[PDB]
Structures are given as structure tokens and as C-alpha cells.
Amino acid sequence: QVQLKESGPGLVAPSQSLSITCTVSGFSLTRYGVHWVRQPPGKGLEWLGVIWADGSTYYNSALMSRLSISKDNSKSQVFLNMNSLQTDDTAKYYCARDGRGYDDYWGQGTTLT
Amino acid sequence: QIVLTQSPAIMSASPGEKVTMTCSASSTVSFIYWYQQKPGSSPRLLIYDTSNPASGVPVRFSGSGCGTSYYLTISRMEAEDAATYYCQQWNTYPLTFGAGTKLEL
Amino acid sequence: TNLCPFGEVFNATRFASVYAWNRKRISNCVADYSVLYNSASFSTFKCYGVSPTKLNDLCFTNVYADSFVIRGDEVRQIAPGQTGKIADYNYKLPDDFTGCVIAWNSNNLDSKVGGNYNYLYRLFRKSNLKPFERDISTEIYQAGSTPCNGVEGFNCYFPLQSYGFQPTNGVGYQPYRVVVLSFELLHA
Ligand SMILES: *[C@@H]1O[C@H](CO)[C@@H](O)[C@H](O)[C@H]1NC(C)=O
């Protein structure tokens, strides 16, 4: 099936760093675009989004230190890393793809902190 | 653009008690997309431009709006349980996600 | 005697693509251009056979309004007498004309993140049109001696292609909205 799947979600630690990867199958990262959205516990979601064919980047953030996209463009996975993300962020992290329209598919990953 | 949302707290006595959804926006927005969520687990499913449905959703929906304020109306059955709604704008960056909370029991 | 109004023509939303454009007819109303003079912020006016002074106290026999969504190079193309894809294929406009032409830039509304594909234009034609006529057709284009038999194949193309307008668009490429009016000075 056309699929998005979530891989190595972050797990509890005293150390405030967290890592998560998402993996895509049945379409190439060179053929469509995938968008990344985050939810704090007890709150609405928060967004980072970019539109590309490949290799392009777009960002807006309230903070961007250490922050830019991280990607393993063999189709294997997309990766996130932050020093303090455990306290700051990421009760759940979500992996999502967009097309021209009405072809939009969502995957959900759960991050332990 | 920042967008602002209102919601009631309400107790029903039957279906057919009509329901309205509203969003208000700080500045002109031309295109909006319409989404419903069930509590507890959060897959995402979409109702798109011209308010046409995606696959796998009931036929009774219609949406039309006015600037800085968007409305779609629903009448009957499972939406009474199932509906929580988010509104998002796709005309220019950043794509603000919006916030709120809604419930019926 | 009462307002027309112009606001339903100009201000309204989701107007037509370049082909299958639309024609509207206006009668029996006050001109009252002064509200347009005050309100307008339009980045171009050009008028042919008339001037913006000596424009009140004129009676126009018929009024027609035509609306378009366009890419800025076409905004220069829309002048009479030119050449180019538009002037050859779509919306040919004659040098003998009495109107005035208005344009303002809609990028805050018409453009789309991921492109606004719904704006459609035609790339090949066997001959070039006379002024003010439409085509709404499809007959698959043949680019060889052999037929492609009404189906896709070798040297065989669908005549229709989609514009894209985005954030951080090329400032000359990005979308424009253009309105044209035609007048004759023969009767009240
Ligand atoms: C266009 O419509 C909007 C709708 O709110 C209105 O505020 C504005 O005054 C209108 N513009 C003109 C020129 O009539």
C-alpha cells in the first residue's frame, strides 16, 4: 500500500535529547512532498512545512538554532534532533505527505520523554 | 495571518439540533481547507477546496464563507460524536495551524 | 437612476481562466467614476481614444466587461498589435478599439502554495484566431505524417497545460487580473 511509517521513536531519558525517524514506501521523495507537524500535550498542533521537488528547503520558526531539515535521501528516512526537545516538545510527532490535492495521507508516531 | 476560534459548551437533547463552525482571521485569506477529527486518536482526513469531500465520508456537508470568516453546516447523525474541526490557510507562509477545543457529549 | 454597480464586476471573486472567458453587459446606471478614482490602487491604467480627464460627462452606448487571470508578461502582451502565444492563440484584440484597460496584482489571493493549477491555457493551433472569438475544443495534436489515431502516442500531445504561481514567485511571472471595457459613441 501507499504508506508512511514511523521508526525509532524517541524514548524516555533524563537527558533532554530525542530522536525520531519516518519512512516512506510506494512513492519516491523525488516525486511528492512530505510535511512535518508536532503537537504539545494538551494543545493544538504546530507546523514546519516546505514544498520541493528535491533538495529545496523552506522554514519559519520561533527559534532555529541547531535547526534545519535533516534527511537521508536514499528514501530510507527523515530525522529530527534537538538538545532539549524532551522537555520543550514532542509528546507526539506526526509524518505527513501532500500532493496537488485530495491525495493527502497521514502517519502518527508517539514519542516517550 | 493569525486566526481566532470560538466554541460552545453544550448539552444535547436530540440529533437535529443544528451545528455551526466558525473561524475568524486577522487578515485577508483566499483559500482554506476543512478538516474533522475524532478525540483520543488523531489520524487526519480532509475536505478540500470547493468544500468537496474526500473519499469515505458522508455526503451531507456544504461549505461557503465570507472574508476573514468561514462556515460549513452539518445536520445529522455521527458528526454529533465525531466532529472536532480545524481551519488552515494556504496562501502564503508560514502555514499557521490554528488552535482550539470542541466537545459534545 | 441608480448604481450599476461596478463592485459586482471588479470586486467579486474566482473569475474566469484565460480561455472560456466571460462577457457581461451593463445598462441604465449612473457612471459615478469618482468612487473608482478615490478607491482604486490599480498599478496600470491605459485608455485608447479617450483620456481620464474629459471622462465624466460622457454617454456610452454599450458597456461590456471581460475578466482574466494572467502572467505579467501577458500584461504587456494584452496591448493591441503585439505578437506572442496569447495574441496568436487566445483573446486577440484589435487595433481599432475605444476602451480602457485596467490591471492590478492579485498575488496575495490568486497564487497558491503548491501552485494554482486551475488556470488553463492552450499551446498549439492550426491557425490563428480573429479578434473576440473563443475556442473550447480538443482534437489531439499530430506532430508527424502518421496519425496518432485519437489517442496518446508518438508525436502526439494534449493541447492543454497548467500555470503555476507560488510564494516567492518570479515578479514578472506572478498572477495579474485584467479587466477590459468597450464603448461606442453613437447613442444614449
Ligand atoms: C469589496 O468587498 C469588500 C467586502 O468586505 C468591501 O469591504 C470593500 O469595500 C469592497 N470594495 C469596493 C471597492 O467596493
- Three cell numbers, residue A45: 498542533
- Three cell numbers, residue A54: 528535491
Which domain does A60 fall in, by range?
Answer: 3-110
C-facing residues of A in 57-86 (CB < 8 A) are none
Report the domain count for chain B: 1
- Three cell numbers, residue C109: 489571493
Which H or E run includes C64?
A: strand C63-71
- Three cell numbers, residue B85: 474541526
Is the Cβ–Cβ distance between B75 and B16 less than 8 Å?
yes
φ/ψ of residue C42, rounded to 5: -75, 125
Distance CA(C51)–CA(C35), nearest Å, equals: 17
Q: Which residues contact A45 (CB under 8 A, 6 or more apart)?
A: A37, A38, A39, A94, B97
Distance from CA of B11 to the nearest CA of A (A): 23
Q: Is the CB of B58 under 6 A from ligand 1?
A: no
What's the CA angle centered on C130, arms C128 and C132, to 5 degrees? 125
Is the dihedral angle over the CA atoms C95, C97, C98, C99 positive or is it negative? negative
Solved how? Answer: cryo-EM
Q: Is the CB of C35 under 6 A from ligand 1?
A: no
Q: Is the CB of C39 under 6 A from ligand 1?
A: yes
Write the CATH number for B21: 2.60.40.10
Distance CA(C180)–CA(C99), nearest Å, equals: 7
User: For residue C39, how far is its CA from the centre of ligand 1 (angstroms)?
Assistant: 10
Among C9, C11, C39, residue to substitute to test ligand 1 (most atoms within 8 Å of Cβ):
C11
Q: Is there a cis peptide before residue C5, judged by omega within 30 degrees of 0?
A: yes
Is residue B8 included in any domain, yes or no?
yes
CB atoms within 10 A of CB A78: 19
Distance CA(C35)–CA(C32), nearest Å, equals: 6
**Chain A residues in contact with C165 (beta carbon < 8 A):** none
Residues paired with residue B20 on neighbouring β-strands, in sequence order = B73
Is the Cβ–Cβ distance between C120 and C162 less than 8 Å?
yes
Domain boundaries, given as residue ranges, for chain C = 1-114+167-188, 115-166
Write the CATH number for A32: 2.60.40.10
Q: Per-residue DSSP letters for chain C? A: -----SHHHHT-SSPPPSTT--EEEE-S----THHHHHH---SEEEESS--SSS-SS---S-EEEEEEEEEHHHHHHTSTT--SHHHHHS----SS---EEEEEE-TTTS--TT--TT-EEE---SS-PPSS--------EE-SSS--TTSSBTTEE-SEEE----TT--TTTSEEEEEEEE---S--
Report the domain count for chain A: 1
C117 vs A: CB within 8 A: yes
Q: Which residues contact A104 (CB under 8 A, 6 or more apart)?
A: A96, A97, A98, B44, B46
Is the Cβ–Cβ distance between C30 and C6 less than 8 Å?
no
Q: Is there a cis peptide before residue B94, judged by omega within 30 degrees of 0?
A: yes
Is residue B68 included in any domain, yes or no?
yes
**Chain C residues in contact with B90 (beta carbon < 8 A):** 112-114
**Chain A residues in contact with B96 (beta carbon < 8 A):** 47
**Chains contacting B (3+ CB pairs below 8 angstroms):** A, C
Q: Per-residue DSSP letters for A40-58? A: -TTS--EEE----SSS---
Which domain does B10 fall in, by range?
Answer: 3-89
Q: Which residues contact A82 (CB under 8 A, 6 or more apart)?
A: A17, A18, A66, A67, A88, A89
